[PDB]
Amino acid sequence: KIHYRKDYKPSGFIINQVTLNINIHDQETIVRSVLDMDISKHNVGEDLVFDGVGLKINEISINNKKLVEGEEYTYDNEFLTIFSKFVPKSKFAFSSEVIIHPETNYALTGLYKSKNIIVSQCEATGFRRITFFIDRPDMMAKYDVTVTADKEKYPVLLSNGDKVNEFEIPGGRHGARFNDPPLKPCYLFAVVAGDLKHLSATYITKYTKKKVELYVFSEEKYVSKLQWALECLKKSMAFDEDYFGLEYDLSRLNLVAVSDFNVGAMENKGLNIFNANSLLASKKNSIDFSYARILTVVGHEYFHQYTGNRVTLRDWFQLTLKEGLTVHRENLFSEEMTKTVTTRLSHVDLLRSVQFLEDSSPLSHPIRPESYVSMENFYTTTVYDKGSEVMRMYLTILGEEYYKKGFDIYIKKNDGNTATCEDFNYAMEQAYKMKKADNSANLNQYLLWFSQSGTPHVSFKYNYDAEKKQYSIHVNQYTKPDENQKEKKPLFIPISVGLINPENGKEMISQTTLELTKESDTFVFNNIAVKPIPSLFRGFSAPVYIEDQLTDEERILLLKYDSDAFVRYNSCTNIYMKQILMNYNEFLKAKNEKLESFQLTPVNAQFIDAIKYLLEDPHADAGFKSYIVSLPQDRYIINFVSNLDTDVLADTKEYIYKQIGDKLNDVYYKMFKSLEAKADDLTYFNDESHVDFDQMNMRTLRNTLLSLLSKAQYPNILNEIIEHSKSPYPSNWLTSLSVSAYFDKYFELYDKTYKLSKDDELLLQEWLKTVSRSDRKDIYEILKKLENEVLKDSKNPNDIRAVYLPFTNNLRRFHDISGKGYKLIAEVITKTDKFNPMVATQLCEPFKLWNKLDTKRQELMLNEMNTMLQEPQISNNLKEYLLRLTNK
Ligand SMILES: CC(C)(C)C(=O)N[C@@H](C(=O)NO)c1ccc(-c2cccc(/C(N)=N/O)c2)cc1
Numbered sequence: 007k008i009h010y011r012k013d014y015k016p017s018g019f020i021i022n023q024v025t026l027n028i029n030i031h032d033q034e035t036i037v038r039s040v041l042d043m044d045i046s047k048h049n050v051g052e053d054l055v056f057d058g059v060g061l062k063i064n065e066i067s068i069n070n071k072k073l074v075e076g077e078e079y080t081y082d083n084e085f086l087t088i089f090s091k092f093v094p095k096s097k098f099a100f101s102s103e104v105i106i107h108p109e110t111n112y113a114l115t116g117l118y119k120s121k122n123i124i125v126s127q128c129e130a131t132g133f134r135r136i137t138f139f140i141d142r143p144d145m146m147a148k149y150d151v152t153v154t155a156d157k158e159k160y161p162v163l164l165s166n167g168d169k170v171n172e173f174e175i176p177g178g179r180h181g182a183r184f185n186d187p188p189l190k191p192c193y194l195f196a197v198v199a200g201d202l203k204h205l206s207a208t209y210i211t212k213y214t215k216k217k218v219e220l221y222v223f224s225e226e227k228y229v230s231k232l233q234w235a236l237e238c239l240k241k242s243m244a245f246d247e248d249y250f251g252l253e254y255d256l257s258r259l260n261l262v263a264v265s266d267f268n269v270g271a272m273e274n275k276g277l278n279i280f281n282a283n284s285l286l287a288s289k290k291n292s293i294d295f296s297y298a299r300i301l302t303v304v305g306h307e308y309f310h311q312y313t314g315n316r317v318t319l320r321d322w323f324q325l326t327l328k329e330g331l332t333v334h335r336e337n338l339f340s341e342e343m344t345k346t347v348t349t350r351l352s353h354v355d356l357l358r359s360v361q362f363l364e365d366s367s368p369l370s371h372p373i374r375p376e377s378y379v380s381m382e383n384f385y386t387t388t389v390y391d392k393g394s395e396v397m398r399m400y401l402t403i404l405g406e407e408y409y410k411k412g413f414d415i416y417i418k419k420n421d422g423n424t425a426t427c428e429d430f431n432y433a434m435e436q437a438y439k440m441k442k443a444d445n446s447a448n449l450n451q452y453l454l455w456f457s458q459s460g461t462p463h464v465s466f467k468y469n470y471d472a473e474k475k476q477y478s479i480h481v482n483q484y485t486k487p488d489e490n491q492k493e494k495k496p497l498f499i500p501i502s503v504g505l506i507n508p509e510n511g512k513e514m515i516s517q518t519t520l521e522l523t524k525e526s527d528t529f530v531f532n533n534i535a536v537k538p539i540p541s542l543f544r545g546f547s548a549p550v551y552i553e554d555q556l557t558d559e560e561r562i563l564l565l566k567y568d569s570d571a572f573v574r575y576n577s578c579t580n581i582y583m584k585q586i587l588m589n590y591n592e593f594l595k596a597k598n599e600k601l602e603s604f605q606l607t608p609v610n611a612q613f614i615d616a617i618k619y620l621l622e623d624p625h626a627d628a629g630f631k632s633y634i635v636s637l638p639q640d641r642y643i644i645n646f647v648s649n650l651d652t653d654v655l656a657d658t659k660e661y662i663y664k665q666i667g668d669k670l671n672d673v674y675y676k677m678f679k680s681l682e683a684k685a686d687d688l689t690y691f692n693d694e695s696h697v698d699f700d701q702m703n704m705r706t707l708r709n710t711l712l713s714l715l716s717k718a719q720y721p722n723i724l725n726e727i728i729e730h731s732k733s734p735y736p737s738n739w740l741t742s743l744s745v746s747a748y749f750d751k752y753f754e755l756y757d758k759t760y761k762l763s764k765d766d767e768l769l770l771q772e773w774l775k776t777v778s779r780s781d782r783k784d785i786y787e788i789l790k791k792l793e794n795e796v797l798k799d800s801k802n803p804n805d806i807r808a809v810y811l812p813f814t815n816n817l818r819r820f821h822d823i824s825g826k827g828y829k830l831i832a833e834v835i836t837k838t839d840k841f842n843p844m845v846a847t848q849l850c851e852p853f854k855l856w857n858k859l860d861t862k863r864q865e866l867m868l869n870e871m872n873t874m875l876q877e878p879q880i881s882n883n884l885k886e887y888l889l890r891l892t893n894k
């Protein structure tokens with residue numbers, strides 16, 4: 007069935023109180039539930055219909071009268087229908103006892119078992135897999151939850167709210183009662199049982215001086231990997247206090263790591279549950295990225311406490327209101343904590359590669375969709391990351407002072423209530439009126455950011471009159487028509503701009519944000535002493551395709567002398583892209599015309615000189631340096647090429663890398679050697695509280711340079727690779743594995759790094775990723791080895807994703823013209839879909855670009871998708887996803 011946003015209507019029923027008894031046993035979990043219910047004003051005497059998926063009914067009742075199946079109710083394993091004539095017309099109690107088995111729940115939705123932990127996951131529609139409920143976010147209720155289990159196996163019992171009772175039970179069992187008086191939607195319900203060890207701390211709030219108990223949990227084996235997460239939690243609480251003036255309102259907050267998790271983490275009230283790879287880390291057993299990952303994910307779930315938990319959603323179409331806004335708050339947090347420009351750059355890099363691809367694919371949708379079949383296919387990079395950019399633009403338009411005012415209005419006005427995207431825009435509009443100093447100013451046009459799909463294209467024309475010292479910027483915006491909107495409307499686009507004097511590299515004007523509200527506009531500047539080079543969309547001030555129309559000479563100057571990190575980064579990107587497009591077409595024509603000889607346009611020499619200039623600047627950011635020596639992501643490039651021949655693009659990249667390498671390899675090597683001391687500094691290796699993001703960036707640079715030098719077969723570089731494998735940092739000795747791919751010492755380091763990784767679950771998954779991403783000619787044989795020797799029949803999403811997803815980024819091998827890469831992944835998708843439809847859909851990501859490739863590869867991918875579609879036992883999740891992707 008298809009749900010439509012305009013069709014929203016309040017339920018005809020009210021659920022005031024939920025009283026749960028969850029009794030966990032060896033071969034079953036018995037769930038007893040009493041729902042104190044009422045009749046709403048929207049009731050028209052309809053049947054009482056509960057959500058309830060895969061529940062085994064022992065008994066159901068109304069006001070303690072046992073109901074008879076068939077006569078008074080029906081249950082089709084999805085909906086429990088109680089005929090209206092048996093439904094009371096005033097306040098009543100609905101009770102039920104059902105049986106579920108978390109032990110065999112491999113979908114990881116509802117209540118399930120992860121190794122030796124019983125854990126729940128209810129967003130979005132997972133609560134209905136635990137007990138009967140009107141499973142929607144506008145059904146707010148109070149929760150009284152009791153959990154019982156075997157004491158030896160599950161000594162630690164957790165749920166939302168305050169633990170009010172702990173008691174022993176005959177037969178070596180024990181129970182714990184949790185009462186949570188504040189109203190909440192059921193997707194925020196959580197329960198955890200297991201042999202958990204913890205680290206703890208006490209946090210005192212900034213303004214009201216409230217004592218908050220912080221707990222982080224994991225299995226005993228990995229308790230030593232919990233410290234950084236605890237630090238991140240404290241940092242998160244501090245930032246929301248310092249930036250937004252928001253304090254935590256509960257007495258206790260628990261973070262819990264589990265090994266089997268479909269996503270990163272979940273913001274269950276007082277009981278945040280994490281993928282282990284997004285909470286656990288140690289410097290000996292984790293790559294550098296884990297530390298940024300944990301900071302962001304812990305921060306993300308914490309910021310949800312206000313934007314998501316205290317102010318909730320009216321319905322699932324408003325998802326971006328809590329997700330886009332929280333990612334935004336998460337990004338502000340991370341930028342403040344890392345104090346490096348690459349943090350912002352990394353988010354732009356992800357958006358413009360992954361989300362832009364989605365936005366131009368058949369899966370394209372606005373951040374607030376008008377319809378859905380599977381809400382499990384709703385949680386997208388569009389909703390999250392474009393949503394975050396849409397939320398961030400409010401800040402750019404209003405400035406920090408008035409944004410904080412607007413955000414405060416939103417929280418104060420909607421605290422303890424459901425809300426919609428209109429509620430947030432309204433709050434922002436109030437601050438906009440204050441800032442603009444007139445009550446006529448509005449943000450009605452801004453709502454189009456929520457409803458209109460596709461990536462806007464913004465192009466520029468420039469003119470300078472030396473006589474009148476007058477400079478103008480003519481701006482045009484354009485969004486391609488798609489299946490969502492035949493006619494696209496102009497958006498409110500904020501363009502943060504600077505003007506650089508090309509003669510001395512100085513700023514010519516103060517900080518300025520151009521407010522483009524029409525299809526096109528001309529912005530004029532007086533008293534401009536000399537023809538400037540425009541610095542456009544500073545900080546990437548809008549989620550758009552930027553077409554600056556600058557010469558490479560101008561882009562080089564910005565790269566060298568502009569103040570804004572993104573514009574420098576983007577100028578470099580634009581120089582690369584122009585080169586990539588030119589060489590691609592040259593290679594393409596040669597292939598098509600079967601030429602015996604042809605010419606390639608060399609890489610701009612002045613550009614190479616500029617890279618060398620920045621690399622040799624001691625005061626330049628190391629992380630920034632790693633970006634400029636790296637070509638744009640393949641998934642970014644494909645947005646600019648029709649019928650992309652992946653082999654030709656691979657040839658293009660290889661030529662460009664070799665050209666730059668032929669001039670800069672000596673510089674690369676010199677830097678790789680000189681960076682070693684600070685990058686691999688071991689001083690704080692045994693201090694899990696000391697995290698230096700600048701240092702980790704230096705390792706990123708070294709490992710990027712090492713990769714370039716290895717591919718280039720730089721003289722005696724194998725020696726460097728061998729010594730690199732002896733480094734204590736996993737980021738280094740895992741890099742040594744992947745860069746050794748070009749040498750016969752590869753399988754030696756394969757065995758060495760495996761032995762180092764095999765005893766840590768998360769580290770082994772990083773090893774799998776490194777092997778999967780290895781630039782090997784025998785990569786298919788290697789994958790077969792991974793399946794037979796390591797992966798086997800594991801149902802762990804982390805294991806499966808680790809083995810297969812990095813390989814799909816192998817431009818040359820995954821897109822083998824035989825189609826065997828497409829066939830391989832499709833088999834894994836179909837296989838995975840049998841027990842975990844959600845992860846199966848995640849594994850479909852490489853097919854998202856299917857209609858952007860050359861016609862042969864289009865046919866190959868389409869055939870595999872249609873083959874998957876013809877699987878008799880295909881899930882609703884996978885089917886709907888593939889149907890949309892293939893325009894059926
Ligand atoms: C930060 C990251 C995106 C990695 C994450 O962990 N997000 C979760 C979140 O919002 N935590 O607060 C997240 C991501 C997806 C989902 C979700 C919920 C329901 C369905 C689906 C789904 N079907 N994805 O394909 C995905 C739930 C939580």
Ligand SMILES: [Mg+2]
Nearest residue numbers: 212244247248
């Ligand atoms: Mg403070």
Ligand SMILES: [Zn+2]
Nearest residue numbers: 306310329332
């Ligand atoms: Zn979230």
